[PDB]
Design a binder for this molecule. Structure first.
Ligand code: NA
Ligand code: NA
Ligand SMILES: [Zn+2]
Ligand SMILES: [Zn+2]
Lengths: 185, 23, 17, 154
């Protein structure tokens, strides 16, 4: 692989109207590809990351919603309001990332525009942008992955740390919280 | 119930540098 | 003198058509 | 239409690479010289010419995309060849790097002007020349992105 070097591309698969209809029916026949899915509700759009066969995203984006699938709506396998996590089984066709095991502190955040931005880990759930960006550049990226140099999942982007519309750091959900969530359940 | 979350796109990390095929 | 000509292109992400 | 950051270019005598960074399509002077670049509307003249840094640039052509410069300072580099091969390179200095696994010189041939990327896929520099020992490339000379930025500011 996912890194060395990390590169990403985005592809749009559904328009506004199609999204609404699919949201109501809960039946999505579109083919799936990739590690990260760009997802949307009626009020917002964000990201969902596949890790170890599970499609994870932020609770603040997905709430308790089901996910549209070829077989109709799919209920979440995991839910953790306190940790701001939700997980569904990874859609057929998707590819999963695997958790980081190298403990690196040099992270790379993948945006909804498929840009890769370097992030220096400063704590369990925070990292600073090497080069700050306007908050608009990060909008709709929550639920997206923070990868280590080897392209393995270190955490999921939760919220930016802004000051005057400028993102200087990011709060993220470390992979560890995913395990804790899966055991809770 | 509420409506479903819907996949409206995807981001692919597994792609590697490639020569763009000439149509 | 002759121009430099573009004979091909490479996309770093591997994005397909 | 899919866009590329890297162009495979050629003159009547050689073939090499060009990389788009910051709206500019850059390459090596030793390859392009003072030449213009072809376009559907005729020859386009160089925007920049830096013989000392062995650098030249034209406006980014159609079907291209600009690559972001590296700002992480990593020493783990990756050189992209004209064949789309990725060569891991360890940064040894401002404009120098050693291949993790040496390659026959032919493997790098025609790649000058191509990019050296960091772990984030950003531009650390442009491949300038292979450093060879009896037909084996063990290191590379490159133009740091900083030089590109400087050239523009000029
Ligand atoms: Na990639
Ligand atoms: Na990208
Ligand atoms: Zn790792
Ligand atoms: Zn970098």
């Amino acid at each position: 692989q996912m890194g060395a070097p990390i590169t990403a591309y985005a592809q749009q698969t559904r328009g506004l109207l199609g999204c609404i209809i699919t949201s109501l029916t809960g039946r999505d026949k579109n083919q799936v590809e990739g590690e990260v899915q760009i997802v949307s509700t009626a009020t917002q759009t964000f990201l969902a990351t596949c890790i170890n066969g599970v499609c994870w995203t932020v609770y603040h984006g997905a709430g308790t919603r089901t996910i549209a699938s070829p077989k109709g709506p799919v209920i979440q396998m995991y839910t953790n309001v306190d940790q701001d996590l939700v997980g569904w089984p990874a859609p057929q066709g998707s590819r999963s990332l695997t958790p980081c095991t190298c403990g690196s502190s040099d992270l790379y955040l993948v945006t909804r525009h498929a840009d890769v931005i370097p992030v220096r880990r400063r704590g369990d759930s925070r990292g600073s942008l090497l080069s700050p960006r306007p908050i608009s550049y990060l909008k709709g990226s929550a639920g997206g992955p923070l990868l280590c140099p080897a392209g393995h999942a270190v955490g999921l982007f939760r919220a930016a740390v802004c000051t005057r519309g400028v993102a200087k750091a990011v709060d993220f959900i470390p992979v560890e919280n995913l395990e804790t969530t899966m055991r809770s359940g | 119930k509420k409506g479903c979350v819907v996949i409206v796109g995807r981001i692919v990390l597994s792609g590697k540098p490639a020569i763009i095929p000439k149509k």
